[PDB]
Subunit: 313 residues, 5 copies
Amino acid sequence: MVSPPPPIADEPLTVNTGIYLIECYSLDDKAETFKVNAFLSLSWKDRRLAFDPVRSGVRVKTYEPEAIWIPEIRFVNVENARDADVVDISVSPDGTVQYLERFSARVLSPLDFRRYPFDSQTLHIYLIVRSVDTRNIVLAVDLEKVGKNDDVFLTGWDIESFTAVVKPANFALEDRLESKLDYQLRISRQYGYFVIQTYLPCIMTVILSQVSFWLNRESVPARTVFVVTTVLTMTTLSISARNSLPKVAYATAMDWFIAVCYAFVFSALIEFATVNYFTKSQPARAAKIDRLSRIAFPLLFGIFNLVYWATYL
Amino acid sequence: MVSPPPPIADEPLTVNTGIYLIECYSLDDKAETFKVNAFLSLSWKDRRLAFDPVRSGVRVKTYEPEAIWIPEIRFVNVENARDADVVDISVSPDGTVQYLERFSARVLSPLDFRRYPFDSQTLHIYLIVRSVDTRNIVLAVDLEKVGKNDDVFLTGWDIESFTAVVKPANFALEDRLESKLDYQLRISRQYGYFVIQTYLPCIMTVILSQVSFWLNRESVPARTVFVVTTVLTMTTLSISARNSLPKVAYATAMDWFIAVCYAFVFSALIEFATVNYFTKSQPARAAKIDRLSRIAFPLLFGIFNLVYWATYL
Amino acid sequence: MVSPPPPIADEPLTVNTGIYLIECYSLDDKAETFKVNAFLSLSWKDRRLAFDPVRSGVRVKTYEPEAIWIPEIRFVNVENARDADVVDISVSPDGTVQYLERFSARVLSPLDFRRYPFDSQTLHIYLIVRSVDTRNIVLAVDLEKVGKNDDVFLTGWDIESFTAVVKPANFALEDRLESKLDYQLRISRQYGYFVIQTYLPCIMTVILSQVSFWLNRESVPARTVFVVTTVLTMTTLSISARNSLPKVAYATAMDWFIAVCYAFVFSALIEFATVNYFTKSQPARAAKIDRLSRIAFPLLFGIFNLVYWATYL
Amino acid sequence: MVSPPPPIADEPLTVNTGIYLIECYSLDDKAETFKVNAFLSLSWKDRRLAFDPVRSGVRVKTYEPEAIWIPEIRFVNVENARDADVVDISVSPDGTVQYLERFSARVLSPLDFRRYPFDSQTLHIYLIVRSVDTRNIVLAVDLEKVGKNDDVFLTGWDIESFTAVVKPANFALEDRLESKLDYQLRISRQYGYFVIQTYLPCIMTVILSQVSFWLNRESVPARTVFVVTTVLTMTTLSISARNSLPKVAYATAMDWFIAVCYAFVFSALIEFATVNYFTKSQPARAAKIDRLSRIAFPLLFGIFNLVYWATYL
Amino acid sequence: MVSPPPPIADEPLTVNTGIYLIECYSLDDKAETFKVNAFLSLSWKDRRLAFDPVRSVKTYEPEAIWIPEIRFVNVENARDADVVDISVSPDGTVQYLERFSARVLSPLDFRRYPFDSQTLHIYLIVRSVDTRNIVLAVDLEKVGKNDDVFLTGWDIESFTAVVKPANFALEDRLESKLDYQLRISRQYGYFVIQTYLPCIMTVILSQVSFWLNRESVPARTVFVVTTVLTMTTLSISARNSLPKVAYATAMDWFIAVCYAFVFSALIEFATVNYFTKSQPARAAKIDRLSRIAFPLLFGIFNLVYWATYL
Ligand SMILES: C[C@]12CC[C@@H](O)C[C@@H]1CC[C@@H]1[C@@H]2CC[C@]2(C)[C@@H](C(=O)CO)CC[C@@H]12
Ligand SMILES: C[C@]12CC[C@@H](O)C[C@@H]1CC[C@@H]1[C@@H]2CC[C@]2(C)[C@@H](C(=O)CO)CC[C@@H]12
Ligand SMILES: C[C@]12CC[C@@H](O)C[C@@H]1CC[C@@H]1[C@@H]2CC[C@]2(C)[C@@H](C(=O)CO)CC[C@@H]12
Ligand SMILES: C[C@]12CC[C@@H](O)C[C@@H]1CC[C@@H]1[C@@H]2CC[C@]2(C)[C@@H](C(=O)CO)CC[C@@H]12
Ligand SMILES: C[C@]12CC[C@@H](O)C[C@@H]1CC[C@@H]1[C@@H]2CC[C@]2(C)[C@@H](C(=O)CO)CC[C@@H]12
Ligand SMILES: [Cl-]
Ligand SMILES: [Cl-]
């Protein structure tokens, strides 16, 4: 068929859109993609399909997508074109078409890891339509048709809300009008897992590094093993932790925690080296160094943990 | 075509459903997905298709799916629309259509890892049908048509039973009635593998850490090597083990075992540090500490193992 | 079309089947799947297609799959429906259809790792056909049409034989007769690779563990490094080795070898701890322990290797 | 249909091409591939489609691709044939066809890692068309139709520009003329990530290796632990780092940095061995060695870092 | 349609074949597969399609005329092909041209690895129909490869075809098989700096132990033990890149000899330590000789090895 001609001769055709999330899975932090399976509902007026509700003994009548003109609606931030199965098409006596499909798609949406792993994100799904030569087409949001099933889960996340920005973005693209809607899924990460995946190994490794201050200054190899193995452990945990993320330029909150832990551990190494350096000559100085490290380190570390967990919680 | 109109003018069309599991594979603990290949059987009454068994020399007659109306049956908790090959369609003289297809699909079903690796799960397969404007459609379960092939296996699991909840869940979705059935595959994990993957390295690492109490207190480096390497081994086993699971918020039984082992090992480190701290001044105290530790540690560890394996077995 | 009517009115239609392996690749131990690319040949009698060999000056005549009835043959133990390209269809004057297609498929067949890596397996490919309402259909095996190309290889394996069980399994399924053939690919693993992947690191790690008995008893740290590092090496090799297999409940022969090596190494640890425990008081006892160990350990290990390699070779 | 015949009887048909990047993702350094989703716009003259703008009350008129001849345009440096959805086809009264599709494709384009990770690249997308026997076909670039969406991101790169080389490469291939255009996406890597992934572990490992010069020369085991563990750490970081790249023949800037760090650390090992060799006889020599090393090493390292970061920044 | 009937009534129809490599990527050493994207060109004589050039090239759609079913043997799935052109000649000569991509499965010989050369094979095959026997041939004009073809780890020597095909019987029909051969040689330098250097340096490090004071037993223990475990790790790591081949590669030999030298250094340290109190002259002599023999035997070994495999 052809696009619905304008009654006002100069009126844009608006398509009322709605998405209802059925399934949400495969949120890939490294790929910054996730997979979604949902209903897409579109609704518009085409009087050419109108009919008398009394002369015609049918109350609605239903068409197949090949029978009538349907607007070409595309997703923007997606990897391939979605896979969709048309579910239903119902026309009204006045000519109002209500189209309903179920689709799955891999959406590509960038994440802000600065606050990670205490981060919240807004996943975006951009709808777009390109105007034809006969008529301009404009997108709109039917709030009645937006929502998500209750059994929608992201195993690592809390799902806050799924909403749409009602006013669309209309703009020129290659000499035609495009209309783009922004659906927004707000989510916040469940950080507890990482607490026992990285934060505990780091804190315990720092404590282990601090145990060296209580060993006899003359047993140099023991303290060497402690300091060195704790340093290498810190480095390994750092690299391991950053291996979960994409190659982002900035630093995450976990990056800061790990870097400060590395500071404390390397400071323990420098302390061990200084004390050993002063052990023969000036044993009073070395002894005082151990005494102060033994008080300062766990105190500064406790204060640091307090400021950090107070801040990011 | 269109849906069969009701004879009672107000009667819902019920679709008799059945699933027969043929193949079950690719149970991914991290993705909380598994792949299934089975028969789907549907059966309903469409009088329009009735025929004279005598005038028509056929006792059944068979149609192609394009020939007759077939209800749109969808899976809910699936990643993509299933891949199906229609196997057979048999109409009865009275108009009873019996439809049979074979499908494969990737089902997405969440797992409860709290008791892991001693966990049981119910994998769900939700069938759903959406009512059309001419008639409401309702799902039901033909028990004769439910089951699973004997050579169905989950390499890591024992399969208990495959049953269906007979009463469906009917609800409103985007202004239409939907009918949902819940097929339930009950399975229980075979934990033995993990016993030799994680639990043994942990137990042996604890014993190794305890060996340090029997080394001469003056040979500080040896005990340092024991304690430190055992601590780092415990940390490595913990991280490694938790790397097999999805980012669940809670803690598994394995988490508890590993955490208690880590408690014992780090406690052995603190013991070595205390003994070394009291070795020059008050050697009687240090000696008494080792004397008691050699009895307490393996005893508390044996008791703990008793409570744990007694509980989770 | 429709299925060939029976001449005996009560005679089952047999389909003569054959598979000719062209390519065999991607044997996945963890997934218990492999990919196969082969010929499938079917042969049956449809009198409707018969013709006079003299009146018709053609010796065979060939049809397209859409032209004639073709039996719906399905694989059982497969992940998706196969991908098939029809190669040829030739009818005989008497009505004998010979159909030939080339297909690729991902077959799922469980492996028995108990004897691994000295294991042999039977990979299964189950063919099946479902009876229609007009006639019962039964599978059979045409040995002339079974075989494999000589350049068929599964890297890391010896291919013994590819045969078929001639008598099929006929059984009732959802009120219809099904006919199932069992094609069997017998293979045996090439263990030599693992000899240099796991067995040598273990044997050398045991020898290294035994070196500790010859170091001076007063150099406690050296022996500590030996015993501890060798123990951790054993643990690492065990975990690494079991990482190649699926989560099987049982233990493989490699598992037994590694476990016995761990027994010897941990026993060397206990020996080092005992000798160190008796080094100050009763130096004769410790000396005797080292003296005996230096003979017993490598002897018991040699005998063990003798029994093991004698058994599994 | 067939291609538009030439008016000059000898004139080549040019197709005006444009690509508008919508989505850019999955830049795989190891595979040297990336995935792209964009608009492809083609424009050519087919006087067979001309029409009177007055007799025909329409100003453009739009066709389906099956209705009219469309040039076979292929990508060269792609893995599979692209996936395209035709978006619009608009003819002008003069016969000017404007075709617009949206496609996704996996482009294969080699990278120059010599300056990695301080590298810039030009990703190429080569368009090509093969001439038919009725007419030669030539490609051209419509600058109005080239560009990229503002929300185009490579989660690790700065995108400089997306341009086209206007003069195409025309050449003979298998006895027909081929016409090839070169679209060029210029990008430059964000190296900061690697600074904290590899460069910091290396620098800290070097400093740690230098700490050994300040330990008492008599505590030989401590210095041994330092030097040896730092050497193995350097080796591990080197291998790990090169594990991110494809098997390129040449050496990267990171390769040079790591190799120089390895030089400094192994030189620290040789220094420790020499000092230990001269510790009993000629302690003055050993002392002089440590005294000089403590000044030389960190100076040569500082200067080295200055030249390196000055050069590659 | 049906296959072209023979003019001699008993003559086989030959199909002139050619492959032109456009794209070559994803050579997987572990899977022994590679991916190829190329032109396939076929040429044969069908007089039924001949025509008077004066009364009337002319081009058909593949559905319009009979086209021979040509299959690849050593492939995982059937290729994906887009027909590019079909041109008939006045005499009936059909020239068909398609562009295809396929994942070819071809075994590699790792014995000389990583100094190995390989011949990747692409086997074409055609099955004879009941009306006529079909035989394959090679149109040299139609064989080649684009210049910008690269294997990101290999030097490409040549791409040629064996002109004489292999004809044989398969399930009661004649099959005709062509062997296209892509000769390549591996660029070993990467492995030179991935494994061989860590091995050589690990051996040197193991040798440093002979110069430490014999009384400092723990230091030498650290050297020997860590160097041994490093050797083991490098061996396992290296063999993790290859399929589970039965035989041994040249890298296997280099790593095995390095392991021999390192474990020999461990045995030397243990012997010296065993004789340090009683017979210190013997231990001293052992170190004296070792310090000369080890680096000499190792240098000579490297000379023979790199001389041989280059
Ligand atoms: C920072 C630097 C010099 C600059 C690089 O070579 C790195 C070393 C690391 C070890 C440091 C050394 C400076 C002197 C220190 C602090 C010694 C002292 O207490 C001096 O009395 C003990 C450890 C030594
Ligand atoms: C907990 C803390 C201080 C707070 C952090 O720096 C961590 C260390 C770890 C080592 C501990 C130390 C406190 C004092 C201990 C218990 C010593 C004593 O028995 C003193 O009698 C031996 C080991 C020492
Ligand atoms: C097995 C056990 C007890 C049970 C767990 O606590 C683990 C320890 C590990 C260290 C063992 C100890 C038993 C006594 C041993 C063998 C000592 C003796 O030869 C006594 O002469 C040296 C090392 C000691
Ligand atoms: C390079 C070489 C010989 C050649 C291989 O066996 C490797 C060793 C490594 C240890 C080196 C040795 C040469 C002599 C050195 C430099 C000793 C000296 O200062 C000599 O005064 C200390 C460490 C020794
Ligand atoms: C090969 C064997 C015995 C057989 C297995 O238990 C493995 C050990 C490994 C350590 C070897 C030992 C034999 C005796 C050696 C060579 C000692 C001597 O110099 C003998 O004087 C030092 C290291 C010892
Ligand atoms: Cl579905
Ligand atoms: Cl393309």
